[PDB]
Design a binder for these strands. Sequence first.
DNA 1: CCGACTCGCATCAGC
DNA 2: GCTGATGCGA
DNA 3: GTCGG
Length: 326
Amino acid sequence: TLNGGITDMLTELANFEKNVSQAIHKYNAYRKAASVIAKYPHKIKSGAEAKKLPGVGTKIAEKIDEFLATGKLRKLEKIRQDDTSSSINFLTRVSGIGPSAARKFVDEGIKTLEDLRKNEDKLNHHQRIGLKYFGDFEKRIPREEMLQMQDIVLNEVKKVDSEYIATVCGSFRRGAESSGDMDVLLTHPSFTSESTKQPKLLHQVVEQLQKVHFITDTLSKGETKFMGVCQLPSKNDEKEYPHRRIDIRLIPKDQYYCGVLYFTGSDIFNKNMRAHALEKGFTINEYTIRPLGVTGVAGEPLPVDSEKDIFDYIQWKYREPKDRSE
DNA sequence: CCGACTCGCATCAGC
DNA sequence: GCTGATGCGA
DNA sequence: GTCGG
Ligand SMILES: Nc1ccn([C@H]2C[C@H](O)[C@@H](COP(=O)(O)CP(=O)(O)OP(=O)(O)O)O2)c(=O)n1
Ligand SMILES: [Cl-]
Ligand SMILES: [Cl-]
Ligand SMILES: [Mn+2]
Ligand SMILES: [Mn+2]
Ligand SMILES: [Mn+2]
Ligand code: NA
Ligand code: NA
Protein backbone atom coordinates (compact mmCIF):
# COMPACT_ATOMS: atom_id res chain seq x y z
CA THR A 1 0.00 0.00 0.00
CA LEU A 2 3.10 2.21 0.07
CA ASN A 3 2.04 4.04 -3.09
CA GLY A 4 -1.72 3.53 -3.15
CA GLY A 5 -2.55 7.11 -4.14
CA ILE A 6 -0.33 6.89 -7.22
CA THR A 7 -1.45 3.44 -8.31
CA ASP A 8 -5.09 4.44 -7.86
CA MET A 9 -4.53 7.48 -10.07
CA LEU A 10 -2.92 5.47 -12.80
CA THR A 11 -5.70 2.87 -12.67
CA GLU A 12 -8.32 5.57 -13.01
CA LEU A 13 -6.40 7.01 -15.94
CA ALA A 14 -6.11 3.52 -17.46
CA ASN A 15 -9.86 3.04 -17.10
CA PHE A 16 -10.48 6.44 -18.68
CA GLU A 17 -8.36 5.57 -21.71
CA LYS A 18 -10.06 2.20 -22.15
CA ASN A 19 -13.67 3.12 -21.50
CA VAL A 20 -13.87 6.68 -22.87
CA SER A 21 -10.95 7.29 -25.23
CA GLN A 22 -10.97 3.71 -26.52
CA ALA A 23 -7.15 3.75 -26.46
CA ILE A 24 -6.23 0.23 -25.40
CA HIS A 25 -2.47 0.71 -25.65
CA LYS A 26 -2.74 3.69 -23.31
CA TYR A 27 -4.85 1.54 -21.02
CA ASN A 28 -2.14 -1.08 -21.03
CA ALA A 29 0.57 1.54 -20.53
CA TYR A 30 -1.15 2.92 -17.43
CA ARG A 31 -1.83 -0.62 -16.20
CA LYS A 32 1.83 -1.57 -16.57
CA ALA A 33 3.00 1.58 -14.78
CA ALA A 34 0.57 0.99 -11.91
CA SER A 35 1.75 -2.60 -11.59
CA VAL A 36 5.48 -1.77 -11.53
CA ILE A 37 4.89 0.95 -8.94
CA ALA A 38 2.62 -1.28 -6.88
CA LYS A 39 5.45 -3.75 -6.21
CA TYR A 40 8.08 -1.02 -5.70
CA PRO A 41 9.05 -1.42 -2.01
CA HIS A 42 9.70 2.24 -1.23
CA LYS A 43 7.28 5.11 -0.71
CA ILE A 44 7.84 7.09 -3.88
CA LYS A 45 8.98 10.65 -3.26
CA SER A 46 9.37 11.97 -6.80
CA GLY A 47 8.40 11.43 -10.40
CA ALA A 48 12.09 11.25 -11.27
CA GLU A 49 12.43 8.37 -8.82
CA ALA A 50 9.41 6.71 -10.40
CA LYS A 51 10.72 7.28 -13.91
CA LYS A 52 13.56 4.83 -13.19
CA LEU A 53 11.02 1.98 -13.19
CA PRO A 54 10.32 0.25 -16.52
CA GLY A 55 7.03 1.43 -17.94
CA VAL A 56 6.99 4.78 -16.12
CA GLY A 57 7.96 7.48 -18.60
CA THR A 58 8.04 11.25 -18.76
CA LYS A 59 4.27 11.85 -18.88
CA ILE A 60 3.49 9.60 -15.93
CA ALA A 61 6.47 11.00 -14.07
CA GLU A 62 5.02 14.49 -14.42
CA LYS A 63 1.64 13.30 -13.17
CA ILE A 64 3.28 11.69 -10.16
CA ASP A 65 4.95 15.04 -9.37
CA GLU A 66 1.58 16.81 -9.58
CA PHE A 67 -0.05 14.17 -7.38
CA LEU A 68 2.78 14.18 -4.85
CA ALA A 69 2.61 17.98 -4.60
CA THR A 70 -1.15 18.43 -4.36
CA GLY A 71 -2.79 15.09 -3.63
CA LYS A 72 -4.75 15.43 -6.86
CA LEU A 73 -4.45 15.33 -10.64
CA ARG A 74 -6.24 18.11 -12.49
CA LYS A 75 -6.71 15.97 -15.59
CA LEU A 76 -8.61 13.47 -13.49
CA GLU A 77 -10.55 16.12 -11.58
CA LYS A 78 -12.01 17.32 -14.88
CA ILE A 79 -12.64 13.84 -16.27
CA ARG A 80 -14.54 13.17 -13.06
CA GLN A 81 -16.66 16.24 -13.81
CA ASP A 82 -17.39 15.64 -17.51
CA ASP A 83 -20.86 14.16 -17.87
CA THR A 84 -20.38 11.91 -20.84
CA SER A 85 -17.10 10.55 -19.56
CA SER A 86 -18.64 9.74 -16.18
CA SER A 87 -21.73 8.18 -17.70
CA ILE A 88 -19.59 6.10 -20.04
CA ASN A 89 -17.31 5.00 -17.21
CA PHE A 90 -20.30 3.97 -15.15
CA LEU A 91 -22.09 1.92 -17.79
CA THR A 92 -18.98 -0.15 -18.60
CA ARG A 93 -19.15 -1.44 -15.03
CA VAL A 94 -22.01 -3.70 -16.21
CA SER A 95 -20.77 -7.05 -17.51
CA GLY A 96 -21.22 -7.16 -21.28
CA ILE A 97 -21.28 -3.37 -21.72
CA GLY A 98 -17.98 -2.26 -23.17
CA PRO A 99 -16.77 1.13 -24.36
CA SER A 100 -18.70 0.81 -27.63
CA ALA A 101 -22.07 -0.07 -26.12
CA ALA A 102 -21.60 2.37 -23.27
CA ARG A 103 -21.18 5.30 -25.67
CA LYS A 104 -24.11 4.19 -27.84
CA PHE A 105 -26.30 3.94 -24.74
CA VAL A 106 -25.16 7.36 -23.49
CA ASP A 107 -25.94 8.63 -27.01
CA GLU A 108 -29.53 7.45 -26.70
CA GLY A 109 -29.89 9.06 -23.28
CA ILE A 110 -29.42 5.83 -21.29
CA LYS A 111 -26.89 6.90 -18.69
CA THR A 112 -27.98 5.75 -15.21
CA LEU A 113 -28.71 2.45 -13.52
CA GLU A 114 -32.39 3.44 -13.52
CA ASP A 115 -32.18 4.16 -17.25
CA LEU A 116 -30.83 0.68 -17.87
CA ARG A 117 -33.52 -0.99 -15.80
CA LYS A 118 -36.17 0.97 -17.69
CA ASN A 119 -34.64 -0.16 -21.01
CA GLU A 120 -33.88 -3.83 -20.42
CA ASP A 121 -35.39 -4.39 -23.89
CA LYS A 122 -32.24 -2.86 -25.42
CA LEU A 123 -29.66 -5.17 -23.76
CA ASN A 124 -28.34 -8.44 -25.11
CA HIS A 125 -28.50 -11.51 -22.85
CA HIS A 126 -25.07 -11.02 -21.27
CA GLN A 127 -25.83 -7.37 -20.50
CA ARG A 128 -29.21 -8.24 -19.02
CA ILE A 129 -27.60 -10.69 -16.61
CA GLY A 130 -24.82 -8.21 -15.82
CA LEU A 131 -27.49 -5.66 -14.93
CA LYS A 132 -29.49 -8.15 -12.86
CA TYR A 133 -26.47 -8.92 -10.68
CA PHE A 134 -24.74 -5.53 -10.86
CA GLY A 135 -24.86 -5.05 -7.12
CA ASP A 136 -23.77 -8.57 -6.25
CA PHE A 137 -20.86 -8.40 -8.73
CA GLU A 138 -19.49 -5.40 -6.82
CA LYS A 139 -18.89 -7.54 -3.74
CA ARG A 140 -15.65 -9.49 -3.33
CA ILE A 141 -15.42 -13.17 -2.39
CA PRO A 142 -13.76 -14.06 0.94
CA ARG A 143 -11.30 -16.89 0.51
CA GLU A 144 -13.36 -18.89 3.02
CA GLU A 145 -16.30 -18.77 0.60
CA MET A 146 -13.97 -19.63 -2.28
CA LEU A 147 -13.12 -22.82 -0.37
CA GLN A 148 -16.77 -23.82 -0.05
CA MET A 149 -17.32 -23.10 -3.77
CA GLN A 150 -14.27 -25.18 -4.61
CA ASP A 151 -15.65 -28.05 -2.53
CA ILE A 152 -18.92 -27.96 -4.42
CA VAL A 153 -17.39 -27.70 -7.88
CA LEU A 154 -14.83 -30.48 -7.33
CA ASN A 155 -17.35 -32.86 -5.81
CA GLU A 156 -19.98 -32.19 -8.45
CA VAL A 157 -17.48 -32.75 -11.25
CA LYS A 158 -16.34 -36.01 -9.62
CA LYS A 159 -19.98 -37.17 -9.69
CA VAL A 160 -20.26 -36.56 -13.43
CA ASP A 161 -17.08 -38.50 -14.20
CA SER A 162 -14.30 -39.38 -11.78
CA GLU A 163 -11.76 -38.80 -14.57
CA TYR A 164 -12.44 -35.07 -14.68
CA ILE A 165 -9.84 -33.00 -12.92
CA ALA A 166 -10.96 -29.50 -11.88
CA THR A 167 -8.48 -26.89 -10.68
CA VAL A 168 -9.35 -23.47 -9.23
CA CYS A 169 -7.04 -20.89 -10.71
CA GLY A 170 -6.96 -17.10 -10.98
CA SER A 171 -6.34 -15.08 -7.84
CA PHE A 172 -7.46 -18.03 -5.71
CA ARG A 173 -4.49 -20.15 -6.84
CA ARG A 174 -2.23 -17.15 -6.22
CA GLY A 175 -3.28 -17.36 -2.57
CA ALA A 176 -5.41 -14.23 -2.44
CA GLU A 177 -7.41 -13.75 0.76
CA SER A 178 -10.31 -12.60 -1.42
CA SER A 179 -11.19 -12.88 -5.12
CA GLY A 180 -13.33 -11.07 -7.66
CA ASP A 181 -14.70 -14.37 -9.05
CA MET A 182 -14.01 -18.09 -9.41
CA ASP A 183 -11.95 -19.49 -12.27
CA VAL A 184 -12.01 -23.25 -12.87
CA LEU A 185 -9.74 -25.10 -15.23
CA LEU A 186 -11.17 -28.44 -16.33
CA THR A 187 -9.51 -31.44 -17.96
CA HIS A 188 -10.70 -34.89 -19.01
CA PRO A 189 -8.61 -37.64 -20.68
CA SER A 190 -11.10 -37.83 -23.55
CA PHE A 191 -10.08 -34.35 -24.77
CA THR A 192 -6.44 -33.91 -25.80
CA SER A 193 -4.67 -31.90 -28.47
CA GLU A 194 -4.82 -35.10 -30.53
CA SER A 195 -8.51 -35.95 -30.32
CA THR A 196 -11.89 -35.33 -28.72
CA LYS A 197 -13.29 -38.74 -27.98
CA GLN A 198 -16.32 -37.63 -25.96
CA PRO A 199 -18.64 -34.71 -26.88
CA LYS A 200 -20.43 -32.44 -24.40
CA LEU A 201 -17.56 -32.60 -21.89
CA LEU A 202 -18.06 -29.04 -20.69
CA HIS A 203 -21.85 -29.12 -21.12
CA GLN A 204 -22.23 -32.15 -18.84
CA VAL A 205 -20.47 -30.23 -16.06
CA VAL A 206 -22.44 -27.03 -16.52
CA GLU A 207 -25.61 -29.12 -16.45
CA GLN A 208 -24.68 -30.91 -13.24
CA LEU A 209 -23.78 -27.61 -11.53
CA GLN A 210 -27.04 -26.15 -12.74
CA LYS A 211 -29.05 -29.11 -11.49
CA VAL A 212 -27.79 -28.64 -7.88
CA HIS A 213 -28.61 -24.91 -8.22
CA PHE A 214 -24.97 -23.83 -7.99
CA ILE A 215 -24.82 -22.27 -11.50
CA THR A 216 -27.81 -19.91 -11.74
CA ASP A 217 -27.25 -18.13 -15.08
CA THR A 218 -25.16 -18.27 -18.27
CA LEU A 219 -23.39 -15.29 -19.88
CA SER A 220 -21.64 -17.27 -22.63
CA LYS A 221 -21.04 -20.93 -23.34
CA GLY A 222 -19.17 -22.85 -26.00
CA GLU A 223 -17.32 -26.11 -26.27
CA THR A 224 -14.36 -25.05 -24.15
CA LYS A 225 -15.30 -21.86 -22.23
CA PHE A 226 -18.22 -21.13 -19.93
CA MET A 227 -18.94 -17.76 -18.39
CA GLY A 228 -21.78 -17.45 -15.92
CA VAL A 229 -23.11 -16.94 -12.48
CA CYS A 230 -23.20 -19.12 -9.36
CA GLN A 231 -24.29 -18.95 -5.71
CA LEU A 232 -23.44 -20.83 -2.52
CA PRO A 233 -26.40 -22.42 -0.73
CA SER A 234 -27.45 -20.59 2.41
CA LYS A 235 -28.57 -22.11 5.73
CA ASN A 236 -32.10 -22.00 7.17
CA ASP A 237 -33.22 -18.39 7.82
CA GLU A 238 -29.91 -16.98 6.66
CA LYS A 239 -29.64 -14.18 4.12
CA GLU A 240 -28.65 -15.50 0.70
CA TYR A 241 -25.02 -15.29 -0.32
CA PRO A 242 -24.29 -12.80 -3.13
CA HIS A 243 -24.42 -14.19 -6.64
CA ARG A 244 -20.89 -14.63 -8.06
CA ARG A 245 -19.24 -14.72 -11.46
CA ILE A 246 -17.73 -18.06 -12.51
CA ASP A 247 -15.59 -18.86 -15.59
CA ILE A 248 -14.79 -22.44 -16.60
CA ARG A 249 -12.17 -23.39 -19.20
CA LEU A 250 -11.87 -26.93 -20.55
CA ILE A 251 -8.25 -27.42 -21.65
CA PRO A 252 -6.71 -30.32 -23.61
CA LYS A 253 -5.40 -32.63 -20.92
CA ASP A 254 -1.90 -32.86 -22.40
CA GLN A 255 -1.74 -29.02 -22.35
CA TYR A 256 -2.71 -28.56 -18.69
CA TYR A 257 0.54 -26.83 -17.66
CA CYS A 258 0.31 -24.08 -20.25
CA GLY A 259 -3.38 -23.83 -19.39
CA VAL A 260 -2.83 -23.56 -15.68
CA LEU A 261 -0.12 -20.95 -16.28
CA TYR A 262 -2.49 -18.84 -18.36
CA PHE A 263 -5.44 -19.20 -15.98
CA THR A 264 -3.48 -18.49 -12.91
CA GLY A 265 -2.28 -15.10 -14.18
CA SER A 266 -2.29 -12.38 -13.17
CA ASP A 267 -3.43 -10.75 -16.39
CA ILE A 268 -0.53 -8.30 -16.16
CA PHE A 269 1.83 -11.18 -15.27
CA ASN A 270 0.74 -13.09 -18.39
CA LYS A 271 1.08 -9.92 -20.50
CA ASN A 272 4.63 -9.40 -19.27
CA MET A 273 5.63 -13.04 -19.64
CA ARG A 274 4.22 -13.42 -23.17
CA ALA A 275 5.96 -10.15 -24.10
CA HIS A 276 9.23 -11.44 -22.68
CA ALA A 277 8.73 -14.74 -24.50
CA LEU A 278 8.52 -12.74 -27.74
CA GLU A 279 11.71 -10.84 -26.91
CA LYS A 280 13.27 -14.28 -26.41
CA GLY A 281 11.92 -15.75 -29.64
CA PHE A 282 8.90 -17.70 -28.41
CA THR A 283 5.16 -17.31 -28.30
CA ILE A 284 3.04 -18.59 -25.41
CA ASN A 285 -0.68 -19.21 -25.34
CA GLU A 286 -2.85 -21.27 -22.98
CA TYR A 287 -2.05 -24.40 -25.02
CA THR A 288 1.60 -24.34 -26.03
CA ILE A 289 4.89 -22.54 -26.14
CA ARG A 290 6.30 -22.45 -29.69
CA PRO A 291 9.55 -21.01 -31.04
CA LEU A 292 9.44 -18.19 -33.58
CA GLY A 293 11.29 -19.10 -36.78
CA VAL A 294 13.60 -16.91 -38.82
CA THR A 295 10.55 -15.02 -40.18
CA GLY A 296 8.43 -14.66 -37.03
CA VAL A 297 6.13 -17.64 -37.72
CA ALA A 298 5.45 -20.06 -34.88
CA GLY A 299 7.07 -23.47 -35.12
CA GLU A 300 6.03 -26.76 -33.52
CA PRO A 301 5.04 -27.01 -29.83
CA LEU A 302 8.00 -27.62 -27.56
CA PRO A 303 7.74 -30.27 -24.82
CA VAL A 304 6.31 -29.02 -21.53
CA ASP A 305 5.99 -31.18 -18.41
CA SER A 306 5.71 -28.51 -15.74
CA GLU A 307 4.91 -24.85 -15.30
CA LYS A 308 8.61 -24.31 -14.66
CA ASP A 309 9.49 -25.78 -18.06
CA ILE A 310 7.83 -22.69 -19.55
CA PHE A 311 9.83 -20.31 -17.35
CA ASP A 312 12.98 -22.26 -18.32
CA TYR A 313 12.54 -21.74 -22.08
CA ILE A 314 12.38 -17.95 -21.72
CA GLN A 315 15.18 -17.77 -19.12
CA TRP A 316 13.07 -16.67 -16.14
CA LYS A 317 13.55 -18.11 -12.66
CA TYR A 318 10.47 -20.00 -11.53
CA ARG A 319 7.86 -17.91 -9.74
CA GLU A 320 5.35 -19.56 -7.44
CA PRO A 321 1.72 -18.59 -8.10
CA LYS A 322 1.61 -16.31 -5.07
CA ASP A 323 4.45 -14.23 -6.56
CA ARG A 324 2.58 -13.70 -9.87
CA SER A 325 0.15 -11.09 -8.52
CA GLU A 326 1.27 -8.21 -10.73
C1' DC B 1 12.13 9.03 -34.02
C1' DC B 2 8.88 4.74 -34.81
C1' DG B 3 6.71 0.48 -34.75
C1' DA B 4 5.08 -2.72 -31.50
C1' DC B 5 2.31 -3.35 -27.71
C1' DT B 6 -3.35 -14.36 -27.10
C1' DC B 7 -7.58 -16.25 -27.61
C1' DG B 8 -13.08 -17.87 -26.84
C1' DC B 9 -17.94 -16.60 -27.55
C1' DA B 10 -21.72 -13.46 -29.24
C1' DT B 11 -23.01 -10.64 -32.73
C1' DC B 12 -23.04 -8.42 -37.14
C1' DA B 13 -21.98 -7.57 -42.20
C1' DG B 14 -21.58 -9.60 -46.31
C1' DC B 15 -22.45 -13.20 -49.48
C1' DG C 1 -25.86 -21.29 -43.74
C1' DC C 2 -20.53 -19.85 -43.63
C1' DT C 3 -16.56 -16.59 -43.09
C1' DG C 4 -14.41 -12.67 -41.28
C1' DA C 5 -14.50 -8.53 -38.43
C1' DT C 6 -15.77 -6.41 -34.14
C1' DG C 7 -17.00 -6.23 -29.21
C1' DC C 8 -16.30 -8.02 -24.92
C1' DG C 9 -14.30 -10.85 -22.03
C1' DA C 10 -10.55 -14.67 -19.58
C1' DG D 1 2.20 6.15 -22.96
C1' DT D 2 6.60 3.87 -23.12
C1' DC D 3 10.77 2.37 -25.01
C1' DG D 4 14.41 -0.79 -27.71
C1' DG D 5 17.22 -0.03 -31.27
N1 LIG E 1 -6.77 -9.71 -19.92
C1 LIG E 1 -6.66 -10.95 -19.22
C2 LIG E 1 -7.64 -11.34 -18.21
C3 LIG E 1 -7.49 -12.54 -17.53
N2 LIG E 1 -6.41 -13.40 -17.89
C4 LIG E 1 -6.20 -14.69 -17.24
C5 LIG E 1 -5.17 -14.47 -16.05
C6 LIG E 1 -6.14 -14.18 -14.94
O1 LIG E 1 -5.54 -14.45 -13.67
C7 LIG E 1 -7.25 -15.25 -15.29
C8 LIG E 1 -8.57 -14.92 -14.55
O2 LIG E 1 -9.04 -13.66 -15.00
P1 LIG E 1 -9.98 -12.88 -13.97
O3 LIG E 1 -10.71 -11.86 -14.86
O4 LIG E 1 -10.89 -13.88 -13.26
C9 LIG E 1 -8.87 -11.86 -12.88
P2 LIG E 1 -8.04 -12.82 -11.54
O5 LIG E 1 -6.53 -12.83 -11.80
O6 LIG E 1 -8.64 -14.20 -11.34
O7 LIG E 1 -8.27 -11.90 -10.24
P3 LIG E 1 -9.73 -11.66 -9.61
O8 LIG E 1 -10.04 -10.16 -9.91
O9 LIG E 1 -9.64 -11.85 -8.12
O10 LIG E 1 -10.71 -12.58 -10.30
O11 LIG E 1 -7.48 -15.17 -16.66
C10 LIG E 1 -5.45 -13.00 -18.93
O12 LIG E 1 -4.49 -13.72 -19.26
N3 LIG E 1 -5.64 -11.80 -19.56
CL1 LIG F 1 -4.12 3.27 -27.73
CL1 LIG G 1 -1.30 -23.58 -30.26
MN1 LIG H 1 -10.66 -14.54 -11.21
MN1 LIG I 1 -12.60 -14.85 -14.15
MN1 LIG J 1 -28.32 -11.74 -5.56
NA1 NA K 1 11.16 4.31 -16.86
NA1 NA L 1 -18.48 -4.02 -18.76
